[PDB]
Amino acid sequence: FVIRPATAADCSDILRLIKELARYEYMEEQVILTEKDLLEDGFGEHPFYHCLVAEVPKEHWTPEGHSIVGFAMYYFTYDPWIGKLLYLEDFFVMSDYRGFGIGSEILKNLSQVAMRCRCSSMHFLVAEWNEPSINFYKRRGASDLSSEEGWRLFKIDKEYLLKMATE
Amino acid sequence: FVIRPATAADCSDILRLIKELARYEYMEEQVILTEKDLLEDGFGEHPFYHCLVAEVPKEHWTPEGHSIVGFAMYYFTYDPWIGKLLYLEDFFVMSDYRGFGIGSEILKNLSQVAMRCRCSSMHFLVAEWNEPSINFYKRRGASDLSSEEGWRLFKIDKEYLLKMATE
Ligand SMILES: CC(C)(COP(=O)(O)OP(=O)(O)OC[C@H]1O[C@@H](n2cnc3c(N)ncnc32)[C@H](O)[C@@H]1OP(=O)(O)O)[C@@H](O)C(=O)NCCC(=O)NCCS
Ligand SMILES: CC(C)(COP(=O)(O)OP(=O)(O)OC[C@H]1O[C@@H](n2cnc3c(N)ncnc32)[C@H](O)[C@@H]1OP(=O)(O)O)[C@@H](O)C(=O)NCCC(=O)NCCS
């Protein structure tokens, strides 16, 4: 397999993989982003995310005829105390393609991106019940991040943003 | 007062304000970013954060002689299900300058940035004990975001990123 940066032509596959992950989490209907959205947000003049994809040889394409079997979606964030961070948002390899080393190589590639960008750390969320991914990550040096303990996450949605923008 | 995007010349003030906020939270020694860091990460060819600052007339500069009395530090993030988000990281107005409407105007400006960028929401963290800021935000339409419930935050620091990058 090959791990490489996605191109505008991979948007179809990125959305397909985003939906497979959402389905793995039983929330596929949550995905309202379109292929056009991904193209615009990812390969327009200012990318709001970056993506690496895992591509297999044609001989081994999926039953559906797709060459992309995994991906990682990330973007850079900033911490006022320490600086640049690489934030890994989505990370998924199709069932039939797991345990082959694809996820490990994607993480190695992300690590190189982090060092090239001089990020001091890579941050990400893992579901509490997912011991297999927790072990995967921790075997590669991850540790718990307590930074948000004692803090509540809030959102101000479009309706209210528009109200404030025009008050 | 004037709310405006920061310029490279404001880096000194941004670091000063970052430290005042850290001090308000009794963790000022946590701040290891330098002025040079902020200049490089914020006004170099690729900004890793954006900043708005609140500037007062010279007649009303701080006892230390500074014109900048508040700021908001933010960057854009991405959610694979809904797209673009505006993430507000730091938000602080100096004590003697609070309750004058500076924070409200900074949030209005951020809201305009969110709509201009077509972000569907603005996300941010607030300390559990800070009822005053919680009320401030909620009066302006904020609501709890449950997206991370059942999830653990993890980090892979530079040491381990370097190890994986070179394995
Ligand atoms: C691991 C994951 C993140 C993607 O990666 P992946 O391609 O399966 O994983 P890798 O093949 O590199 O394998 C990791 C392992 O395979 C085993 N492995 C790796 N290469 C192997 C090979 N060539 N032969 C046999 N076993 C191998 C190892 O035991 C490592 O397990 P370890 O976790 O105990 O250290 C996958 O669980 C995925 O999509 N999982 C479901 C979604 C998910 O949990 N995502 C992250 C958070 S929501
Ligand atoms: C509000 C905060 C975020 C910055 O903003 P600010 O300039 O003080 O606030 P504003 O002046 O726009 O005032 C908000 C209020 O002032 C009062 N107010 C606003 N303009 C006013 C005026 N001209 N005259 C009198 N009262 C006024 C209102 O009651 C509003 O309170 P409300 O919160 O109940 O809706 C400030 O608390 C700050 O730095 N706080 C400490 C750090 C912090 O908590 N940061 C966020 C998270 S770590």
Short mmCIF file of C-alpha atoms and ligand atoms in Angstrom, two decimals:
data_model
loop_
_atom_site.label_atom_id
_atom_site.label_comp_id
_atom_site.label_asym_id
_atom_site.label_seq_id
_atom_site.Cartn_x
_atom_site.Cartn_y
_atom_site.Cartn_z
CA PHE A 1 0.00 0.00 0.00
CA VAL A 2 0.90 3.66 -0.43
CA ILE A 3 0.16 6.44 2.08
CA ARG A 4 -0.05 9.80 0.31
CA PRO A 5 -1.62 13.25 0.55
CA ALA A 6 -5.10 13.31 -0.95
CA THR A 7 -5.77 15.21 -4.20
CA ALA A 8 -9.00 16.88 -5.34
CA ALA A 9 -9.78 13.65 -7.23
CA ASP A 10 -9.98 11.71 -3.94
CA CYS A 11 -12.91 13.73 -2.52
CA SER A 12 -15.39 11.04 -3.52
CA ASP A 13 -13.38 8.52 -1.55
CA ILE A 14 -12.92 10.83 1.42
CA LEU A 15 -16.65 11.32 1.78
CA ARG A 16 -17.21 7.59 1.36
CA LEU A 17 -14.70 6.86 4.17
CA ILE A 18 -16.14 9.62 6.37
CA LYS A 19 -19.51 7.91 6.06
CA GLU A 20 -18.10 4.40 6.77
CA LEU A 21 -16.55 5.78 9.99
CA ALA A 22 -19.85 7.48 10.89
CA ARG A 23 -21.61 4.17 10.24
CA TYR A 24 -19.03 2.31 12.40
CA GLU A 25 -20.14 4.74 15.11
CA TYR A 26 -23.86 4.30 14.24
CA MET A 27 -24.34 7.96 13.26
CA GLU A 28 -24.02 7.97 9.47
CA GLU A 29 -27.01 10.31 9.05
CA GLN A 30 -25.00 12.92 10.91
CA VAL A 31 -22.82 13.41 7.84
CA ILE A 32 -24.25 16.33 5.88
CA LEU A 33 -21.06 17.44 4.15
CA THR A 34 -21.06 16.89 0.36
CA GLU A 35 -18.32 15.98 -2.09
CA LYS A 36 -18.47 19.56 -3.37
CA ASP A 37 -17.99 20.74 0.23
CA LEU A 38 -14.82 18.66 0.68
CA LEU A 39 -13.42 19.81 -2.64
CA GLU A 40 -14.03 23.44 -1.75
CA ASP A 41 -12.85 23.22 1.88
CA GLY A 42 -9.91 20.94 1.15
CA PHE A 43 -8.41 21.93 -2.19
CA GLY A 44 -9.66 25.43 -2.70
CA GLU A 45 -7.13 28.22 -2.22
CA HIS A 46 -7.28 27.88 1.62
CA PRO A 47 -7.57 24.32 2.98
CA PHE A 48 -9.56 23.98 6.20
CA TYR A 49 -8.30 20.42 6.62
CA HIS A 50 -5.59 18.17 5.17
CA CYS A 51 -5.92 14.52 4.39
CA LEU A 52 -3.71 11.47 3.89
CA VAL A 53 -5.20 8.41 2.16
CA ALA A 54 -4.12 4.75 1.95
CA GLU A 55 -4.21 3.43 -1.63
CA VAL A 56 -3.91 -0.27 -2.56
CA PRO A 57 -2.94 -1.88 -5.90
CA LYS A 58 -5.75 -2.30 -8.45
CA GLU A 59 -5.53 -6.10 -7.99
CA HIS A 60 -6.68 -5.54 -4.45
CA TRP A 61 -9.32 -2.81 -4.82
CA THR A 62 -12.45 -3.09 -2.70
CA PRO A 63 -15.44 -5.15 -3.94
CA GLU A 64 -16.92 -1.76 -4.96
CA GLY A 65 -13.89 -0.99 -7.12
CA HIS A 66 -12.21 1.63 -4.91
CA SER A 67 -8.46 1.97 -4.42
CA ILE A 68 -8.62 4.09 -1.24
CA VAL A 69 -9.08 2.05 1.89
CA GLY A 70 -8.08 4.39 4.70
CA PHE A 71 -7.55 7.96 5.66
CA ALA A 72 -6.62 10.49 8.30
CA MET A 73 -8.12 14.00 8.37
CA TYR A 74 -6.23 16.67 10.36
CA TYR A 75 -5.63 20.40 10.71
CA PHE A 76 -3.26 22.51 12.78
CA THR A 77 -4.36 24.24 15.97
CA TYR A 78 -2.68 26.59 18.44
CA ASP A 79 -2.19 26.62 22.19
CA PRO A 80 -1.27 30.12 23.54
CA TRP A 81 1.11 28.54 26.02
CA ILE A 82 3.13 26.16 23.80
CA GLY A 83 2.29 27.03 20.17
CA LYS A 84 1.61 24.77 17.13
CA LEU A 85 -0.26 21.50 17.46
CA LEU A 86 -1.32 18.90 14.91
CA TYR A 87 -4.92 17.89 15.60
CA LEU A 88 -5.98 14.54 14.24
CA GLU A 89 -9.78 14.68 13.65
CA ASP A 90 -10.75 11.45 11.78
CA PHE A 91 -8.68 8.30 11.40
CA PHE A 92 -10.17 5.17 9.79
CA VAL A 93 -9.16 2.05 7.81
CA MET A 94 -11.82 -0.19 6.22
CA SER A 95 -12.46 -3.45 8.13
CA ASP A 96 -11.06 -5.80 5.53
CA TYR A 97 -7.89 -3.71 5.40
CA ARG A 98 -7.00 -3.40 9.13
CA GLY A 99 -4.12 -5.11 10.90
CA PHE A 100 -1.88 -4.84 7.83
CA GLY A 101 0.12 -1.83 9.05
CA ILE A 102 -1.83 0.84 7.15
CA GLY A 103 -2.86 2.78 10.29
CA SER A 104 0.68 2.59 11.69
CA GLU A 105 2.13 4.04 8.48
CA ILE A 106 -0.47 6.79 8.36
CA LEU A 107 0.50 7.76 11.96
CA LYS A 108 4.23 7.73 10.98
CA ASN A 109 3.41 10.06 8.13
CA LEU A 110 1.41 12.35 10.41
CA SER A 111 4.36 12.39 12.82
CA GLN A 112 6.67 13.54 10.04
CA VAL A 113 4.17 16.30 9.11
CA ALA A 114 4.10 17.35 12.80
CA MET A 115 7.88 17.54 12.99
CA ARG A 116 8.21 19.28 9.63
CA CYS A 117 5.73 21.90 10.89
CA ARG A 118 7.51 22.04 14.30
CA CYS A 119 4.33 21.14 16.19
CA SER A 120 5.19 20.16 19.75
CA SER A 121 2.40 17.55 19.98
CA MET A 122 -0.43 15.77 18.15
CA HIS A 123 -3.81 15.77 19.92
CA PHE A 124 -6.88 13.63 19.31
CA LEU A 125 -9.98 12.09 20.86
CA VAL A 126 -10.60 8.34 21.37
CA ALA A 127 -13.94 6.79 22.55
CA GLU A 128 -13.76 5.49 26.12
CA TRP A 129 -14.93 1.99 25.18
CA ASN A 130 -12.41 1.51 22.38
CA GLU A 131 -9.63 -0.33 24.22
CA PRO A 132 -8.21 -1.60 20.92
CA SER A 133 -7.54 1.98 19.61
CA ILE A 134 -6.55 3.17 23.05
CA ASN A 135 -3.92 0.40 23.15
CA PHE A 136 -2.90 1.17 19.54
CA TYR A 137 -2.24 4.80 20.42
CA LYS A 138 -0.63 4.21 23.76
CA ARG A 139 1.78 1.64 22.36
CA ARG A 140 2.97 4.48 20.09
CA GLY A 141 3.59 6.85 22.93
CA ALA A 142 0.26 8.56 23.48
CA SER A 143 -0.74 9.71 26.96
CA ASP A 144 -3.87 11.21 28.50
CA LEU A 145 -4.19 14.94 28.07
CA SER A 146 -5.77 16.58 31.16
CA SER A 147 -5.89 20.11 29.73
CA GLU A 148 -9.74 20.19 29.50
CA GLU A 149 -10.50 18.79 32.95
CA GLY A 150 -12.76 21.24 34.80
CA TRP A 151 -13.82 22.89 31.53
CA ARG A 152 -17.12 22.77 29.61
CA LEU A 153 -17.37 22.76 25.81
CA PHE A 154 -19.82 25.30 24.37
CA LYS A 155 -21.06 26.19 20.89
CA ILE A 156 -22.75 29.25 19.36
CA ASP A 157 -24.53 28.05 16.21
CA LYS A 158 -25.11 29.92 12.94
CA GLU A 159 -28.48 31.37 13.98
CA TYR A 160 -26.92 33.16 16.91
CA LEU A 161 -23.74 34.06 15.09
CA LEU A 162 -25.85 35.76 12.43
CA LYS A 163 -27.87 37.58 15.13
CA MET A 164 -24.71 38.96 16.77
CA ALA A 165 -23.09 39.80 13.42
CA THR A 166 -26.09 42.03 12.57
CA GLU A 167 -27.13 43.50 15.95
CA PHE B 1 -12.37 51.64 21.69
CA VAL B 2 -11.56 49.96 18.39
CA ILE B 3 -11.67 46.20 17.72
CA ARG B 4 -9.32 45.29 14.86
CA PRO B 5 -7.22 42.46 13.47
CA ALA B 6 -3.78 42.35 15.06
CA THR B 7 -0.67 43.25 13.02
CA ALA B 8 2.88 41.97 13.44
CA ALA B 9 3.55 45.07 15.58
CA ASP B 10 1.03 43.87 18.19
CA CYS B 11 2.91 40.65 19.05
CA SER B 12 4.43 42.22 22.15
CA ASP B 13 0.94 43.05 23.37
CA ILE B 14 -0.46 39.65 22.45
CA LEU B 15 2.14 37.87 24.53
CA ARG B 16 1.58 40.31 27.39
CA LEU B 17 -2.18 39.59 27.30
CA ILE B 18 -1.61 35.84 26.98
CA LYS B 19 0.44 36.02 30.16
CA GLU B 20 -2.16 38.16 32.03
CA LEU B 21 -4.80 35.52 31.18
CA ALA B 22 -2.43 32.74 32.32
CA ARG B 23 -1.87 34.69 35.53
CA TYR B 24 -5.65 35.16 35.99
CA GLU B 25 -5.73 31.36 35.87
CA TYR B 26 -2.68 31.04 38.19
CA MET B 27 -0.53 29.30 35.55
CA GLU B 28 1.58 32.08 34.07
CA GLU B 29 4.75 29.94 34.10
CA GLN B 30 3.01 27.65 31.64
CA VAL B 31 3.51 30.24 28.91
CA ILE B 32 6.70 29.35 27.05
CA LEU B 33 5.85 30.93 23.71
CA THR B 34 8.01 33.96 22.81
CA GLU B 35 7.26 37.17 20.94
CA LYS B 36 9.32 35.80 18.05
CA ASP B 37 7.14 32.66 18.14
CA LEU B 38 3.92 34.68 17.81
CA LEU B 39 5.35 36.77 15.01
CA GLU B 40 6.42 33.68 13.11
CA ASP B 41 3.27 31.62 13.76
CA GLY B 42 0.86 34.53 13.33
CA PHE B 43 2.17 36.77 10.56
CA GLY B 44 4.53 34.55 8.68
CA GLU B 45 3.34 33.29 5.30
CA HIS B 46 0.96 30.73 6.93
CA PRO B 47 -0.84 31.89 10.10
CA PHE B 48 -1.51 29.16 12.66
CA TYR B 49 -3.84 31.50 14.55
CA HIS B 50 -5.62 34.81 13.99
CA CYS B 51 -6.10 37.54 16.52
CA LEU B 52 -8.37 40.52 17.15
CA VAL B 53 -7.23 43.16 19.66
CA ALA B 54 -9.07 45.95 21.52
CA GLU B 55 -7.24 49.28 21.30
CA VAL B 56 -8.08 52.34 23.43
CA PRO B 57 -7.25 56.04 22.84
CA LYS B 58 -3.80 57.19 24.01
CA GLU B 59 -5.48 59.30 26.73
CA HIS B 60 -6.66 56.06 28.24
CA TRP B 61 -3.65 53.76 27.80
CA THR B 62 -2.81 51.41 30.65
CA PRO B 63 -0.58 52.59 33.54
CA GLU B 64 2.22 50.72 31.70
CA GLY B 65 1.63 52.76 28.56
CA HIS B 66 -0.08 50.11 26.41
CA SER B 67 -2.95 50.78 24.02
CA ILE B 68 -4.10 47.15 23.68
CA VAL B 69 -6.37 46.05 26.48
CA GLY B 70 -8.06 42.92 25.16
CA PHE B 71 -7.85 40.19 22.62
CA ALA B 72 -9.33 37.03 21.14
CA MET B 73 -7.15 34.31 19.59
CA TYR B 74 -8.85 31.85 17.20
CA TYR B 75 -8.28 29.47 14.30
CA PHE B 76 -10.56 27.46 12.04
CA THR B 77 -11.18 23.76 12.58
CA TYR B 78 -13.13 21.10 10.71
CA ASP B 79 -15.79 18.57 11.65
CA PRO B 80 -16.13 15.73 9.06
CA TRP B 81 -19.88 15.74 9.55
CA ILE B 82 -20.73 19.46 9.24
CA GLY B 83 -17.61 21.22 7.91
CA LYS B 84 -15.99 24.56 8.91
CA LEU B 85 -15.92 25.75 12.50
CA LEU B 86 -14.44 28.83 14.13
CA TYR B 87 -12.63 27.80 17.31
CA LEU B 88 -12.12 30.50 19.88
CA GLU B 89 -9.00 29.59 21.92
CA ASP B 90 -8.20 32.62 24.19
CA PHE B 91 -10.48 35.53 25.02
CA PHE B 92 -9.44 38.14 27.61
CA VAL B 93 -9.97 41.81 28.53
CA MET B 94 -7.82 43.47 31.23
CA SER B 95 -9.60 43.93 34.58
CA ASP B 96 -9.77 47.71 34.51
CA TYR B 97 -11.28 47.53 31.02
CA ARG B 98 -14.11 44.98 31.51
CA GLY B 99 -17.83 45.73 31.56
CA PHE B 100 -17.45 48.48 28.95
CA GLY B 101 -18.64 46.39 25.98
CA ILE B 102 -15.20 45.43 24.65
CA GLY B 103 -15.76 41.66 24.97
CA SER B 104 -19.23 41.94 23.40
CA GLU B 105 -17.81 43.79 20.38
CA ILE B 106 -14.97 41.31 19.99
CA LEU B 107 -17.57 38.47 19.92
CA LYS B 108 -19.65 40.40 17.31
CA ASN B 109 -16.54 40.71 15.20
CA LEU B 110 -15.76 37.01 15.58
CA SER B 111 -19.35 36.24 14.55
CA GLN B 112 -18.90 38.25 11.36
CA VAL B 113 -15.65 36.38 10.63
CA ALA B 114 -17.53 33.07 11.18
CA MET B 115 -20.29 34.06 8.77
CA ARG B 116 -17.88 35.47 6.19
CA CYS B 117 -16.03 32.13 6.29
CA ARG B 118 -19.36 30.21 6.25
CA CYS B 119 -18.55 28.38 9.49
CA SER B 120 -21.67 26.75 10.86
CA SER B 121 -20.68 27.29 14.52
CA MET B 122 -18.11 28.78 16.90
CA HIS B 123 -16.77 26.41 19.59
CA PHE B 124 -14.90 27.18 22.80
CA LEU B 125 -14.14 26.02 26.33
CA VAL B 126 -15.24 27.79 29.55
CA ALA B 127 -14.09 26.83 33.11
CA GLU B 128 -16.85 25.16 35.13
CA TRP B 129 -16.58 27.63 38.02
CA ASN B 130 -16.80 30.73 35.86
CA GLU B 131 -20.53 31.49 36.08
CA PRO B 132 -19.93 35.08 34.98
CA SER B 133 -18.43 34.01 31.58
CA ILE B 134 -20.87 31.15 31.29
CA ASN B 135 -23.72 33.66 31.67
CA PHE B 136 -21.98 36.08 29.27
CA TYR B 137 -21.80 33.41 26.59
CA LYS B 138 -25.21 31.93 27.14
CA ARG B 139 -26.91 35.31 27.01
CA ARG B 140 -25.43 35.55 23.49
CA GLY B 141 -26.85 32.25 22.38
CA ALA B 142 -24.24 29.71 23.41
CA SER B 143 -25.31 26.20 24.39
CA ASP B 144 -23.52 23.14 25.77
CA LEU B 145 -21.81 21.02 23.17
CA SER B 146 -22.05 17.28 24.04
CA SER B 147 -19.92 16.06 21.11
CA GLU B 148 -17.00 14.91 23.36
CA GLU B 149 -19.03 13.09 25.99
CA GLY B 150 -17.76 9.51 26.26
CA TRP B 151 -14.44 10.45 24.64
CA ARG B 152 -10.94 10.82 26.11
CA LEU B 153 -8.41 13.43 24.99
CA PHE B 154 -4.94 12.07 24.20
CA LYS B 155 -1.62 13.58 23.16
CA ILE B 156 1.53 12.21 21.51
CA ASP B 157 4.36 14.61 22.39
CA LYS B 158 7.41 15.59 20.32
CA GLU B 159 9.65 12.83 21.72
CA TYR B 160 7.31 10.14 20.48
CA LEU B 161 6.46 11.92 17.26
CA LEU B 162 10.16 12.07 16.45
CA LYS B 163 10.54 8.35 17.32
CA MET B 164 7.72 7.36 14.95
CA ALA B 165 8.90 9.74 12.22
CA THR B 166 12.30 7.98 12.20
CA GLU B 167 11.44 4.32 12.94
C1 LIG C 1 -5.84 0.85 13.91
C2 LIG C 1 -6.93 1.77 13.16
C3 LIG C 1 -7.04 3.18 13.78
C4 LIG C 1 -6.51 2.00 11.67
O1 LIG C 1 -5.40 1.22 11.52
P1 LIG C 1 -4.97 -0.21 11.06
O2 LIG C 1 -4.58 -0.21 9.65
O3 LIG C 1 -5.92 -1.25 11.46
O4 LIG C 1 -3.89 -0.73 12.00
P2 LIG C 1 -2.40 -1.29 11.78
O5 LIG C 1 -2.63 -2.41 10.90
O6 LIG C 1 -1.18 -0.39 11.54
O7 LIG C 1 -2.25 -2.27 13.01
C5 LIG C 1 -2.06 -1.79 14.32
C6 LIG C 1 -1.78 -3.18 14.67
O8 LIG C 1 -1.87 -4.34 13.81
C7 LIG C 1 -1.23 -5.27 14.44
N1 LIG C 1 -0.39 -5.28 13.04
C8 LIG C 1 0.17 -4.28 12.31
N2 LIG C 1 0.72 -4.64 11.20
C9 LIG C 1 0.52 -6.01 11.15
C10 LIG C 1 0.89 -7.02 10.15
N3 LIG C 1 1.55 -6.69 9.02
N4 LIG C 1 0.54 -8.29 10.41
C11 LIG C 1 -0.11 -8.62 11.53
N5 LIG C 1 -0.51 -7.76 12.53
C12 LIG C 1 -0.16 -6.43 12.28
C13 LIG C 1 -0.53 -4.76 15.73
O9 LIG C 1 -0.95 -5.60 16.78
C14 LIG C 1 -0.98 -3.18 15.91
O10 LIG C 1 -1.77 -3.55 17.12
P3 LIG C 1 -1.23 -2.84 18.41
O11 LIG C 1 -2.46 -1.87 18.21
O12 LIG C 1 -1.55 -3.65 19.61
O13 LIG C 1 0.00 -2.01 18.57
C15 LIG C 1 -8.29 0.88 12.95
O14 LIG C 1 -8.76 0.41 14.27
C16 LIG C 1 -9.63 1.60 12.43
O15 LIG C 1 -10.09 2.24 11.51
N6 LIG C 1 -10.37 1.26 13.55
C17 LIG C 1 -11.79 1.64 13.76
C18 LIG C 1 -12.01 3.18 13.84
C19 LIG C 1 -11.22 3.81 14.96
O16 LIG C 1 -11.15 3.27 16.09
N7 LIG C 1 -10.58 4.96 14.75
C20 LIG C 1 -9.75 5.79 15.64
C21 LIG C 1 -10.74 6.62 16.51
S1 LIG C 1 -12.59 7.01 16.31
C1 LIG C 2 -16.50 39.31 29.40
C2 LIG C 2 -14.96 38.92 29.18
C3 LIG C 2 -14.80 37.57 28.45
C4 LIG C 2 -14.26 39.97 28.25
O1 LIG C 2 -15.22 40.93 28.06
P1 LIG C 2 -15.71 42.28 28.65
O2 LIG C 2 -15.12 43.42 27.94
O3 LIG C 2 -15.62 42.33 30.12
O4 LIG C 2 -17.23 42.29 28.68
P2 LIG C 2 -18.35 43.28 28.08
O5 LIG C 2 -18.01 44.54 28.72
O6 LIG C 2 -18.77 43.30 26.61
O7 LIG C 2 -19.54 43.07 29.10
C5 LIG C 2 -20.32 41.91 29.09
C6 LIG C 2 -21.19 42.62 30.02
O8 LIG C 2 -20.98 43.92 30.61
C7 LIG C 2 -22.13 44.26 31.09
N1 LIG C 2 -21.87 45.53 30.11
C8 LIG C 2 -21.49 45.62 28.79
N2 LIG C 2 -21.32 46.81 28.34
C9 LIG C 2 -21.59 47.63 29.42
C10 LIG C 2 -21.57 49.09 29.57
N3 LIG C 2 -21.24 49.90 28.54
N4 LIG C 2 -21.90 49.59 30.77
C11 LIG C 2 -22.23 48.78 31.80
N5 LIG C 2 -22.29 47.40 31.77
C12 LIG C 2 -21.94 46.87 30.52
C13 LIG C 2 -23.26 43.26 30.73
O9 LIG C 2 -23.88 42.90 31.94
C14 LIG C 2 -22.53 42.00 29.95
O10 LIG C 2 -22.83 41.11 31.11
P3 LIG C 2 -23.78 39.92 30.71
O11 LIG C 2 -22.46 39.06 30.71
O12 LIG C 2 -24.56 39.48 31.89
O13 LIG C 2 -24.49 39.69 29.41
C15 LIG C 2 -14.15 39.17 30.57
O14 LIG C 2 -14.78 38.38 31.65
C16 LIG C 2 -12.63 38.66 30.71
O15 LIG C 2 -11.52 38.77 30.23
N6 LIG C 2 -12.91 37.83 31.79
C17 LIG C 2 -11.90 36.98 32.46
C18 LIG C 2 -11.28 35.89 31.53
C19 LIG C 2 -12.32 34.96 30.97
O16 LIG C 2 -13.25 34.52 31.70
N7 LIG C 2 -12.28 34.60 29.70
C20 LIG C 2 -13.15 33.73 28.90
C21 LIG C 2 -12.71 32.27 29.21
S1 LIG C 2 -11.14 31.56 30.01
#
